[PDB]
Protein backbone atom coordinates (compact mmCIF):
# COMPACT_ATOMS: atom_id res chain seq x y z
CA UNK A 1 0.00 0.00 0.00
CA UNK A 2 0.97 3.87 -0.08
CA UNK A 3 -0.81 4.13 -3.57
CA UNK A 4 -2.00 7.56 -4.38
CA UNK A 5 -5.26 7.31 -6.55
CA UNK A 6 -6.55 10.32 -9.08
CA UNK A 7 -10.17 10.12 -10.93
CA UNK A 8 -9.34 12.77 -13.93
CA UNK A 9 -11.06 12.94 -16.93
CA UNK A 10 -9.07 12.83 -20.07
CA UNK A 11 -9.35 16.93 -20.25
CA UNK A 12 -7.13 16.92 -17.39
CA UNK A 13 -4.70 14.49 -17.50
CA UNK A 14 -0.79 16.25 -17.95
CA UNK A 15 1.48 14.60 -20.47
CA UNK A 16 3.40 12.84 -18.12
CA UNK A 17 0.84 10.95 -17.65
CA UNK A 18 -0.51 10.21 -21.06
CA UNK A 19 3.06 9.16 -21.58
CA UNK A 20 2.87 6.83 -18.56
CA UNK A 21 -0.39 5.66 -19.28
CA UNK A 22 0.70 4.55 -23.15
CA UNK A 23 3.63 3.00 -21.95
CA UNK A 24 1.64 0.75 -19.08
CA UNK A 25 -0.89 0.00 -21.37
CA UNK A 26 1.63 -1.60 -24.42
CA UNK A 27 3.47 -3.43 -21.13
CA UNK A 28 0.32 -4.86 -20.25
CA UNK A 29 -1.16 -5.65 -23.65
CA UNK A 30 1.85 -6.09 -25.57
CA UNK A 31 0.26 -6.29 -29.25
CA UNK A 32 -3.29 -7.37 -28.05
CA UNK A 33 -3.87 -3.57 -27.70
CA UNK A 34 -5.14 -2.02 -31.07
CA UNK A 35 -4.96 1.57 -32.27
CA UNK A 36 -8.51 0.89 -32.24
CA UNK A 37 -8.32 -0.29 -28.24
CA UNK A 38 -6.70 3.18 -27.69
CA UNK A 39 -9.07 5.18 -29.03
CA UNK A 40 -11.40 3.69 -27.18
CA UNK A 41 -9.56 4.45 -23.71
CA UNK A 42 -10.05 8.43 -24.39
CA UNK A 43 -12.62 10.82 -24.35
CA UNK A 44 -14.05 10.04 -20.60
CA UNK A 45 -12.72 9.71 -16.68
CA UNK A 46 -9.25 7.98 -15.64
CA UNK A 47 -9.00 6.12 -12.37
CA UNK A 48 -4.58 6.08 -11.70
CA UNK A 49 -2.80 4.39 -9.26
CA UNK A 50 0.49 6.42 -8.58
CA UNK A 51 3.60 4.85 -6.47
CA UNK A 52 5.37 8.31 -5.48
CA UNK A 53 5.37 10.44 -8.39
CA UNK A 54 5.02 7.20 -11.11
CA UNK A 55 2.07 5.41 -12.47
CA UNK A 56 1.39 1.82 -11.75
CA UNK A 57 -2.53 1.63 -12.20
CA UNK A 58 -5.13 2.38 -14.61
CA UNK A 59 -9.00 2.54 -15.31
CA UNK A 60 -11.08 4.22 -17.59
CA UNK A 61 -14.79 4.84 -17.75
CA UNK A 62 -16.28 6.31 -21.19
CA UNK A 63 -19.80 7.50 -21.80
CA UNK A 64 -21.91 5.06 -24.30
CA UNK A 65 -25.25 5.01 -25.11
CA UNK A 66 -27.12 2.21 -25.62
CA UNK A 67 -30.57 0.75 -26.03
CA UNK A 68 -31.67 -1.76 -23.60
CA UNK A 69 -34.98 -3.70 -24.94
CA UNK A 70 -35.82 -0.22 -27.11
CA UNK A 71 -35.49 2.12 -24.12
CA UNK A 72 -32.33 4.51 -24.39
CA UNK A 73 -29.47 3.72 -21.36
CA UNK A 74 -26.88 5.69 -20.27
CA UNK A 75 -23.76 3.42 -19.97
CA UNK A 76 -20.31 3.60 -17.88
CA UNK A 77 -18.13 1.26 -20.22
CA UNK A 78 -15.41 0.12 -18.45
CA UNK A 79 -11.97 0.16 -20.54
CA UNK A 80 -8.34 -0.34 -20.51
CA UNK A 81 -7.49 -2.01 -16.96
CA UNK A 82 -3.90 -2.53 -16.27
CA UNK A 83 -1.28 -2.87 -13.33
CA UNK A 84 2.44 -3.17 -13.88
CA UNK A 85 3.72 -6.17 -13.38
CA UNK A 86 5.80 -6.23 -10.06
CA UNK A 87 2.49 -4.03 -8.73
CA UNK A 88 0.11 -6.61 -9.40
CA UNK A 89 -0.17 -8.19 -5.89
CA UNK A 90 -1.12 -5.43 -3.58
CA UNK A 91 -5.35 -4.31 -4.39
CA UNK A 92 -4.46 -1.71 -6.44
CA UNK A 93 -6.92 -3.34 -8.84
CA UNK A 94 -9.75 -3.86 -6.62
CA UNK A 95 -9.23 0.09 -5.60
CA UNK A 96 -9.36 1.23 -9.23
CA UNK A 97 -12.95 -0.76 -9.17
CA UNK A 98 -14.38 0.94 -6.38
CA UNK A 99 -13.38 3.92 -7.48
CA UNK A 100 -14.73 3.42 -10.62
CA UNK A 101 -17.76 1.79 -9.12
CA UNK A 102 -18.44 5.08 -7.71
CA UNK A 103 -18.01 7.05 -10.85
CA UNK A 104 -20.24 5.09 -12.97
CA UNK A 105 -23.24 5.40 -9.87
CA UNK A 106 -22.66 9.17 -9.97
CA UNK A 107 -23.33 9.32 -13.45
CA UNK A 108 -24.70 6.59 -15.64
CA UNK A 109 -27.66 4.12 -15.39
CA UNK A 110 -25.58 0.90 -15.74
CA UNK A 111 -21.86 -0.24 -15.76
CA UNK A 112 -21.07 -2.75 -18.93
CA UNK A 113 -17.27 -3.96 -19.43
CA UNK A 114 -16.05 -7.03 -21.58
CA UNK A 115 -13.77 -9.34 -18.89
CA UNK A 116 -10.60 -10.37 -20.03
CA UNK A 117 -8.27 -14.22 -19.47
CA UNK A 118 -6.83 -12.33 -16.65
CA UNK A 119 -9.92 -10.89 -14.63
CA UNK A 120 -13.30 -12.01 -14.60
CA UNK A 121 -12.58 -12.47 -10.49
CA UNK A 122 -11.65 -9.15 -9.57
CA UNK A 123 -14.86 -7.77 -11.14
CA UNK A 124 -17.46 -10.06 -9.56
CA UNK A 125 -15.50 -9.58 -5.94
CA UNK A 126 -17.09 -5.80 -6.02
CA UNK A 127 -20.44 -6.63 -7.43
CA UNK A 128 -20.05 -7.20 -10.99
CA UNK A 129 -22.06 -10.18 -12.61
CA UNK A 130 -22.58 -11.82 -16.23
CA UNK A 131 -24.71 -9.91 -18.78
CA UNK A 132 -27.32 -12.71 -19.63
CA UNK A 133 -29.29 -11.06 -22.53
CA UNK A 134 -28.47 -11.30 -25.89
CA UNK A 135 -26.03 -8.29 -27.25
CA UNK A 136 -25.84 -6.57 -30.62
CA UNK A 137 -23.89 -4.57 -32.11
CA UNK A 138 -23.88 -1.68 -35.62
CA UNK A 139 -22.46 -3.51 -38.97
CA UNK A 140 -22.92 -1.07 -41.27
CA UNK A 141 -26.37 0.45 -40.38
CA UNK A 142 -27.81 -2.65 -39.24
CA UNK A 143 -27.94 -4.54 -35.76
CA UNK A 144 -26.52 -7.68 -36.18
CA UNK A 145 -25.86 -10.01 -32.47
CA UNK A 146 -22.86 -10.33 -30.87
CA UNK A 147 -22.76 -13.82 -29.96
CA UNK A 148 -18.56 -13.95 -29.89
CA UNK A 149 -18.75 -11.70 -26.61
CA UNK A 150 -22.43 -13.24 -24.89
CA UNK A 151 -20.83 -14.48 -21.95
CA UNK A 152 -17.34 -11.94 -21.78
CA UNK A 153 -19.76 -9.11 -21.04
CA UNK A 154 -20.64 -7.99 -17.27
CA UNK A 155 -22.44 -5.29 -15.96
CA UNK A 156 -22.82 -3.80 -12.60
CA UNK A 157 -26.13 -1.92 -11.32
CA UNK A 158 -25.99 1.64 -9.51
CA UNK A 159 -28.60 2.41 -7.19
CA UNK A 160 -31.30 1.06 -10.05
CA UNK A 161 -32.70 -2.42 -11.45
CA UNK A 162 -31.76 -3.77 -14.91
CA UNK A 163 -33.27 -6.37 -16.12
CA UNK A 164 -29.89 -8.67 -16.92
CA UNK A 165 -31.80 -10.47 -19.27
CA UNK A 166 -32.80 -7.98 -21.90
CA UNK A 167 -31.31 -7.70 -25.10
CA UNK A 168 -28.33 -4.35 -25.43
CA UNK A 169 -27.69 -2.51 -28.21
CA UNK A 170 -24.16 -0.81 -28.34
CA UNK A 171 -23.32 2.41 -30.05
CA UNK A 172 -20.54 2.18 -32.89
CA UNK A 173 -16.49 2.39 -32.65
CA UNK A 174 -13.92 1.16 -34.47
CA UNK A 175 -12.26 -2.56 -33.38
CA UNK A 176 -14.36 -4.34 -31.35
CA UNK A 177 -17.82 -2.95 -30.47
CA UNK A 178 -17.33 -4.33 -26.95
CA UNK B 1 -15.31 18.12 3.21
CA UNK B 2 -14.43 19.36 0.13
CA UNK B 3 -11.17 19.96 -1.73
CA UNK B 4 -10.33 21.33 -5.19
CA UNK B 5 -12.01 19.55 -8.38
CA UNK B 6 -11.33 19.70 -11.69
CA UNK B 7 -9.71 22.83 -12.94
CA UNK B 8 -10.26 27.00 -12.96
CA UNK B 9 -9.48 30.27 -14.64
CA UNK B 10 -10.66 33.88 -14.42
CA UNK B 11 -11.68 36.27 -16.77
CA UNK B 12 -12.41 39.63 -15.80
CA UNK B 13 -13.72 38.51 -12.49
CA UNK B 14 -15.83 35.53 -13.63
CA UNK B 15 -14.17 32.25 -12.90
CA UNK B 16 -14.66 29.84 -15.06
CA UNK B 17 -14.74 25.87 -13.45
CA UNK B 18 -14.35 22.49 -15.65
CA UNK B 19 -15.97 19.68 -14.03
CA UNK B 20 -17.02 16.41 -14.98
CA UNK B 21 -20.40 15.27 -13.60
CA UNK B 22 -18.73 12.60 -11.33
CA UNK B 23 -16.60 15.47 -9.63
CA UNK B 24 -20.03 18.21 -8.46
CA UNK B 25 -21.86 17.87 -5.42
CA UNK B 26 -25.97 17.34 -5.90
CA UNK B 27 -26.30 21.16 -4.90
CA UNK B 28 -24.15 21.92 -7.65
CA UNK B 29 -26.38 19.99 -9.79
CA UNK B 30 -29.48 21.35 -8.67
CA UNK B 31 -27.72 25.33 -9.19
CA UNK B 32 -27.49 24.14 -13.00
CA UNK B 33 -30.73 23.01 -12.80
CA UNK B 34 -32.22 25.99 -11.78
CA UNK B 35 -29.88 27.98 -14.54
CA UNK B 36 -30.89 25.98 -17.57
CA UNK B 37 -34.92 26.21 -16.87
CA UNK B 38 -34.79 30.51 -16.22
CA UNK B 39 -31.99 30.93 -18.95
CA UNK B 40 -34.75 28.52 -21.78
CA UNK B 41 -37.47 30.00 -20.17
CA UNK B 42 -39.33 26.85 -19.50
CA UNK B 43 -37.93 25.24 -22.93
CA UNK B 44 -35.64 22.99 -21.29
CA UNK B 45 -36.81 19.69 -21.10
CA UNK B 46 -36.11 16.86 -18.54
CA UNK B 47 -34.61 14.75 -21.45
CA UNK B 48 -32.62 17.53 -22.41
CA UNK B 49 -30.94 17.86 -18.54
CA UNK B 50 -30.59 13.70 -18.96
CA UNK B 51 -28.46 15.10 -22.13
CA UNK B 52 -26.52 17.29 -19.99
CA UNK B 53 -24.56 15.15 -17.96
CA UNK B 54 -22.43 12.27 -18.05
CA UNK B 55 -19.03 14.63 -19.47
CA UNK B 56 -17.39 17.86 -18.89
CA UNK B 57 -19.09 21.03 -17.82
CA UNK B 58 -17.80 24.46 -17.91
CA UNK B 59 -19.19 26.75 -15.96
CA UNK B 60 -19.01 30.20 -14.63
CA UNK B 61 -19.69 32.11 -11.50
CA UNK B 62 -19.61 35.89 -10.64
CA UNK B 63 -18.45 35.68 -7.24
CA UNK B 64 -20.57 32.42 -5.99
CA UNK B 65 -23.55 33.10 -8.83
CA UNK B 66 -23.84 30.51 -11.54
CA UNK B 67 -24.54 32.73 -14.17
CA UNK B 68 -23.26 30.62 -16.75
CA UNK B 69 -22.49 26.76 -18.20
CA UNK B 70 -21.68 24.60 -20.79
CA UNK B 71 -21.91 20.52 -21.24
CA UNK B 72 -19.50 18.52 -23.59
CA UNK B 73 -20.76 14.61 -24.23
CA UNK B 74 -18.91 12.17 -25.12
CA UNK B 75 -21.16 10.70 -28.57
CA UNK B 76 -20.02 8.02 -30.83
CA UNK B 77 -21.11 8.39 -34.22
CA UNK B 78 -20.35 6.94 -37.71
CA UNK B 79 -19.30 9.48 -40.64
CA UNK B 80 -20.23 7.74 -43.24
CA UNK B 81 -19.63 4.18 -42.43
CA UNK B 82 -16.18 5.40 -40.49
CA UNK B 83 -16.23 5.70 -36.68
CA UNK B 84 -16.15 9.23 -35.33
CA UNK B 85 -15.38 10.25 -31.58
CA UNK B 86 -17.85 13.43 -31.22
CA UNK B 87 -17.93 16.32 -28.29
CA UNK B 88 -21.10 17.08 -28.14
CA UNK B 89 -22.30 20.29 -26.55
CA UNK B 90 -25.06 20.66 -24.64
CA UNK B 91 -27.10 23.30 -22.69
CA UNK B 92 -25.00 26.53 -23.50
CA UNK B 93 -26.52 29.22 -21.63
CA UNK B 94 -25.95 32.66 -20.02
CA UNK B 95 -28.00 34.34 -17.14
CA UNK B 96 -30.09 37.16 -18.65
CA UNK B 97 -28.62 39.91 -16.93
CA UNK B 98 -24.97 38.54 -17.72
CA UNK B 99 -25.39 38.61 -21.71
CA UNK B 100 -23.12 41.02 -23.79
CA UNK B 101 -19.82 40.68 -21.16
CA UNK B 102 -18.02 37.49 -23.01
CA UNK B 103 -19.20 34.89 -20.83
CA UNK B 104 -20.53 32.41 -23.93
CA UNK B 105 -17.41 33.15 -25.55
CA UNK B 106 -15.11 32.12 -22.90
CA UNK B 107 -17.29 29.03 -21.94
CA UNK B 108 -16.82 28.13 -25.90
CA UNK B 109 -13.33 28.70 -25.73
CA UNK B 110 -13.19 26.06 -22.76
CA UNK B 111 -15.29 23.48 -24.57
CA UNK B 112 -12.71 23.71 -28.04
CA UNK B 113 -10.17 23.24 -25.55
CA UNK B 114 -12.15 20.35 -24.17
CA UNK B 115 -12.73 19.27 -27.63
CA UNK B 116 -9.69 19.67 -28.96
CA UNK B 117 -8.02 17.32 -26.52
CA UNK B 118 -10.49 14.93 -26.10
CA UNK B 119 -12.63 14.36 -29.46
CA UNK B 120 -11.99 13.84 -33.15
CA UNK B 121 -15.26 16.40 -33.85
CA UNK B 122 -17.84 19.06 -32.00
CA UNK B 123 -21.32 19.00 -32.74
CA UNK B 124 -23.99 20.89 -31.32
CA UNK B 125 -27.39 21.71 -32.38
CA UNK B 126 -27.84 25.83 -32.50
CA UNK B 127 -31.18 27.94 -32.91
CA UNK B 128 -31.11 30.80 -35.31
CA UNK B 129 -30.62 33.60 -32.86
CA UNK B 130 -27.37 31.22 -31.50
CA UNK B 131 -25.35 30.68 -35.03
CA UNK B 132 -23.50 33.71 -34.42
CA UNK B 133 -21.97 33.08 -31.44
CA UNK B 134 -20.90 29.50 -32.44
CA UNK B 135 -19.54 31.20 -36.30
CA UNK B 136 -17.19 33.65 -33.91
CA UNK B 137 -15.31 31.10 -32.60
CA UNK B 138 -14.86 28.37 -35.62
CA UNK B 139 -18.09 25.84 -36.11
CA UNK B 140 -19.60 26.02 -39.37
CA UNK B 141 -22.55 24.33 -40.26
CA UNK B 142 -22.84 20.51 -41.49
CA UNK B 143 -23.58 19.99 -44.62
CA UNK B 144 -24.11 16.31 -45.09
CA UNK B 145 -27.13 14.55 -44.37
CA UNK B 146 -27.89 13.48 -40.43
CA UNK B 147 -29.42 10.15 -39.54
CA UNK B 148 -30.85 9.02 -36.31
CA UNK B 149 -31.55 5.65 -34.76
CA UNK B 150 -35.21 5.35 -34.34
CA UNK B 151 -36.38 2.17 -32.91
CA UNK B 152 -33.14 0.13 -34.42
CA UNK B 153 -33.16 1.62 -37.68
CA UNK B 154 -31.41 4.73 -39.22
CA UNK B 155 -34.09 7.39 -40.21
CA UNK B 156 -32.92 10.73 -41.88
CA UNK B 157 -32.95 13.77 -39.42
CA UNK B 158 -34.38 16.45 -41.73
CA UNK B 159 -35.63 18.69 -39.80
CA UNK B 160 -31.93 18.95 -38.20
CA UNK B 161 -30.21 19.10 -41.37
CA UNK B 162 -28.54 22.86 -41.39
CA UNK B 163 -29.14 23.33 -37.39
CA UNK B 164 -26.31 21.38 -36.58
CA UNK B 165 -22.59 22.57 -36.33
CA UNK B 166 -18.93 21.51 -36.03
CA UNK B 167 -15.78 22.25 -35.24
CA UNK B 168 -12.96 20.12 -36.52
CA UNK B 169 -10.19 19.10 -33.52
CA UNK B 170 -6.88 20.02 -35.09
CA UNK B 171 -7.33 17.10 -38.54
CA UNK B 172 -9.32 17.00 -41.32
CA UNK B 173 -13.22 15.99 -41.23
CA UNK B 174 -15.46 16.19 -44.73
CA UNK B 175 -18.33 18.21 -43.76
CA UNK B 176 -20.11 16.61 -46.48
CA UNK B 177 -20.13 13.14 -45.22
CA UNK B 178 -23.74 11.93 -43.58
CA UNK B 179 -23.69 11.67 -40.12
CA UNK B 180 -25.23 8.45 -38.08
CA UNK B 181 -25.48 9.64 -34.26
CA UNK B 182 -26.02 7.31 -31.36
CA UNK B 183 -29.47 6.38 -29.87
CA UNK B 184 -30.45 8.68 -26.94
CA UNK B 185 -33.82 9.52 -25.11
CA UNK B 186 -36.03 12.47 -25.89
CA UNK B 187 -34.43 14.90 -28.73
CA UNK B 188 -31.33 12.80 -30.81
CA UNK B 189 -29.58 16.06 -32.08
C1 LIG C 1 -14.32 -14.88 -25.28
N1 LIG C 1 -13.05 -14.82 -24.54
C2 LIG C 1 -12.41 -13.49 -24.47
C3 LIG C 1 -11.92 -12.98 -25.82
O1 LIG C 1 -13.00 -12.74 -26.74
C4 LIG C 1 -11.29 -11.64 -25.61
O2 LIG C 1 -12.25 -10.72 -25.06
C5 LIG C 1 -11.99 -9.40 -25.48
C6 LIG C 1 -11.87 -8.47 -24.29
O3 LIG C 1 -10.81 -9.00 -23.48
C7 LIG C 1 -11.58 -7.03 -24.81
O4 LIG C 1 -11.45 -6.06 -23.73
C8 LIG C 1 -10.17 -6.22 -23.09
O5 LIG C 1 -9.19 -6.15 -24.15
C9 LIG C 1 -9.18 -4.90 -24.88
C10 LIG C 1 -8.16 -5.04 -26.02
N2 LIG C 1 -7.34 -6.25 -25.83
C11 LIG C 1 -8.85 -3.80 -23.89
C12 LIG C 1 -9.92 -3.77 -22.79
C13 LIG C 1 -9.94 -5.12 -22.06
N3 LIG C 1 -10.96 -5.13 -21.00
C14 LIG C 1 -10.57 -4.15 -19.96
C15 LIG C 1 -11.64 -4.06 -18.87
O6 LIG C 1 -9.36 -4.60 -19.34
C16 LIG C 1 -12.79 -6.61 -25.61
N4 LIG C 1 -12.64 -5.22 -26.07
C17 LIG C 1 -12.98 -7.57 -26.76
C18 LIG C 1 -13.20 -8.98 -26.28
N5 LIG C 1 -13.41 -9.89 -27.41
O7 LIG C 1 -10.10 -11.68 -24.79
C19 LIG C 1 -10.56 -12.12 -23.48
C20 LIG C 1 -11.22 -13.51 -23.54
C21 LIG C 1 -11.75 -13.89 -22.16
O8 LIG C 1 -10.25 -14.48 -23.99
C1 LIG D 1 -34.47 24.07 -37.35
N1 LIG D 1 -34.64 25.22 -36.43
C2 LIG D 1 -34.33 24.96 -35.01
C3 LIG D 1 -35.30 23.96 -34.34
O1 LIG D 1 -35.31 22.66 -34.94
C4 LIG D 1 -34.89 23.78 -32.90
O2 LIG D 1 -33.54 23.26 -32.80
C5 LIG D 1 -33.38 22.47 -31.60
C6 LIG D 1 -32.07 22.79 -30.90
O3 LIG D 1 -32.12 24.19 -30.63
C7 LIG D 1 -31.95 21.90 -29.61
O4 LIG D 1 -30.71 22.14 -28.87
C8 LIG D 1 -30.90 23.36 -28.13
O5 LIG D 1 -32.07 23.09 -27.34
C9 LIG D 1 -31.96 21.96 -26.40
C10 LIG D 1 -33.31 21.69 -25.82
N2 LIG D 1 -34.18 22.81 -26.22
C11 LIG D 1 -30.86 22.26 -25.42
C12 LIG D 1 -29.59 22.43 -26.21
C13 LIG D 1 -29.74 23.59 -27.21
N3 LIG D 1 -28.48 23.70 -27.94
C14 LIG D 1 -27.56 24.05 -26.85
C15 LIG D 1 -26.11 24.06 -27.31
O6 LIG D 1 -27.92 25.37 -26.42
C16 LIG D 1 -31.84 20.47 -30.08
N4 LIG D 1 -31.63 19.57 -28.93
C17 LIG D 1 -33.11 20.14 -30.84
C18 LIG D 1 -33.27 21.01 -32.05
N5 LIG D 1 -34.49 20.59 -32.76
O7 LIG D 1 -35.01 25.01 -32.15
C19 LIG D 1 -34.07 25.97 -32.73
C20 LIG D 1 -34.41 26.24 -34.22
C21 LIG D 1 -33.46 27.24 -34.87
O8 LIG D 1 -35.74 26.76 -34.31
Same mark, same amino acid.
Given at each position: ??????? #????? /?? /?????????????????? @????????? #????? &???????????????? $???????????????????????????????????? $????????????? /?????????????? &?????????? @????????????????? &????????? &?? @???????? @????? $??
Amino acid at each position: MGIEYRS #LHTSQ /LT /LSEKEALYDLLIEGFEGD @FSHDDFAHT #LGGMH &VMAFDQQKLVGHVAII $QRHMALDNTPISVGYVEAMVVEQSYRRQGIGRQLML $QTNKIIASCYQLG /LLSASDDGQKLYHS &VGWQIWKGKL @FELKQGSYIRSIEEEGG &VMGWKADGE &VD @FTASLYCD @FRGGD $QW
